Structure formats: structure tokens, C-alpha cells
């Protein structure tokens, strides 16, 4: 009797805990992913403007 | 000796004379020219054949992105 109660105990909470942890992660991480990409873009261009100024002044 | 400035006079004279008769290599004669002409070319080589009386300007573009 007692075995099944504790056994079921792990398995039911497991599937929850894992899925609520999965849900929370994707929100921030996916917004971070978007973010980082914007990041990488912006940089390059100011660089491109910057480089032209050095080049022509030389 | 004693002549300090009377010597400098002697040197001075020819400096003006040449300037007030400018032409070719200045009483030097062609000989200065023959070197000069090579030297002027060589210096062009150090900067390549980019014209120096022009102003450069161009546009510049973009590549792959993410």
C-alpha cells in the first residue's frame, strides 16, 4: 500500500515541476535570444560607419 | 681671424643672383633635372598612382546578417 503512494508521489510532481521549470525558462531565454541578435547587429554597423571615417581620413 | 661678416657677404651674393634668373636647374643646368625626374616618380610609387588633386569619395554597402 504505502509503496505505491510514495512512488506515485514522485512521478506525478516530477512531471509538473519539470514542465513549470521549462515554461519559466523559455520566456526569458527566448527574449534573451532576440535581444542578443539585435546586439550583435547594431555593433557592426557603428563599426562600419567608424571604419569609413578612419579610412578616408588616412 | 677678423672678417666674420665680410665672408658671409661673399656667400650671400649668388643666392639672390640665381633666384632672379630662375630657369631649369638654376645655373646647375640639365644635370639637376635628370635626377629630379626619377625622384618625383619614385615618390608616386610609395603612394601609388592615386591622383592628389582629386578628392575621393565612395559608398559602402552591407553583407550577410543574422
UniProtKB/Swiss-Prot annotation, chain A:
UniProt lineage: Eukaryota, Metazoa, Chordata, Craniata, Vertebrata
Residues of the full protein shown: 134 to 191 of 256
Modified-residue entries (N6-acetyllysine), positions: 6, 21, 29
Leader sequence residues: none
Family to which the UniProt record says this protein belongs: Belongs to the eukaryotic ATPase B chain family.
Subunit structure: Component of the ATP synthase complex composed at least of ATP5F1A/subunit alpha, ATP5F1B/subunit beta, ATP5MC1/subunit c (homooctomer), MT-ATP6/subunit a, MT-ATP8/subunit 8, ATP5ME/subunit e, ATP5MF/subunit f, ATP5MG/subunit g, ATP5MK/subunit k, ATP5MJ/subunit j, ATP5F1C/subunit gamma, ATP5F1D/subunit delta, ATP5F1E/subunit epsilon, ATP5PF/subunit F6, ATP5PB/subunit b, ATP5PD/subunit d, ATP5PO/subunit OSCP.
Entry's localization field: Mitochondrion; Mitochondrion inner membrane
Organism of origin: Bos taurus (Bovine)
Function (record text): Subunit b, of the mitochondrial membrane ATP synthase complex (F(1)F(0) ATP synthase or Complex V) that produces ATP from ADP in the presence of a proton gradient across the membrane which is generated by electron transport complexes of the respiratory chain. ATP synthase complex consist of a soluble F(1) head domain - the catalytic core - and a membrane F(1) domain - the membrane proton channel. These two domains are linked by a central stalk rotating inside the F(1) region and a stationary peripheral stalk.
Sections of the chain in a coiled coil: none
Official protein name in the record: ATP synthase peripheral stalk subunit b, mitochondrial
From Swiss-Prot, chain B:
Molecular-function GO terms, alphabetical: proton transmembrane transporter activity
GO cellular component terms listed in the entry, alphabetical order: mitochondrial inner membrane; mitochondrion; proton-transporting ATP synthase complex
Residues with the N6-acetyllysine modification: 6, 11, 44, 49, 64
Compartments where located: Mitochondrion; Mitochondrion inner membrane
Keywords from the UniProt entry: Acetylation, CF(0), Hydrogen ion transport, Ion transport, Membrane, Mitochondrion, Mitochondrion inner membrane, Phosphoprotein, Transit peptide, Transport
Residues with the N6-succinyllysine modification: 49, 64
Biological processes annotated in GO: proton motive force-driven ATP synthesis
Purpose of the protein: Subunit F6, of the mitochondrial membrane ATP synthase complex (F(1)F(0) ATP synthase or Complex V) that produces ATP from ADP in the presence of a proton gradient across the membrane which is generated by electron transport complexes of the respiratory chain. ATP synthase complex consist of a soluble F(1) head domain - the catalytic core - and a membrane F(1) domain - the membrane proton channel. These two domains are linked by a central stalk rotating inside the F(1) region and a stationary peripheral stalk.
Complex and partners: Component of the ATP synthase complex composed at least of ATP5F1A/subunit alpha, ATP5F1B/subunit beta, ATP5MC1/subunit c (homooctomer), MT-ATP6/subunit a, MT-ATP8/subunit 8, ATP5ME/subunit e, ATP5MF/subunit f, ATP5MG/subunit g, ATP5MK/subunit k, ATP5MJ/subunit j, ATP5F1C/subunit gamma, ATP5F1D/subunit delta, ATP5F1E/subunit epsilon, ATP5PF/subunit F6, ATP5PB/subunit b, ATP5PD/subunit d, ATP5PO/subunit OSCP.
Similarity comment text for this entry: Belongs to the eukaryotic ATPase subunit F6 family.
Protein name: ATP synthase peripheral stalk subunit F6, mitochondrial
Residues of the full protein shown: 36 to 101 of 108
Amino acid at each position: 500500500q504505502l509503496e505505491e503512494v510514495k512512488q506515485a508521489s514522485i512521478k506525478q510532481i516530477q512531471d509538473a515541476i519539470d514542465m513549470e521549470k521549462s515554461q519559466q525558462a523559455l520566456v526569458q531565454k527566448r527574449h534573451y535570444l532576440f535581444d542578443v541578435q539585435r546586439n550583435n547587429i547594431a555593433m557592426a554597423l557603428e563599426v562600419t560607419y567608424r571604419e569609413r571615417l578612419h579610412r578616408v581620413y588616412r | 681671424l677678423d672678417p666674420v661678416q665680410k665672408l658671409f657677404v661673399d656667400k650671400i651674393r649668388e643666392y639672390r643672383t640665381k633666384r632672379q634668373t630662375s630657369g631649369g636647374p638654376v645655373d646647375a643646368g640639365p644635370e639637376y633635372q635628370q635626377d629630379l625626374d626619377r625622384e618625383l616618380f619614385k615618390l608616386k610609387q610609395m603612394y601609388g598612382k592615386a591622383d592628389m588633386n582629386t578628392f575621393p569619395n565612395f559608398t559602402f554597402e552591407d553583407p550577410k546578417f543574422e
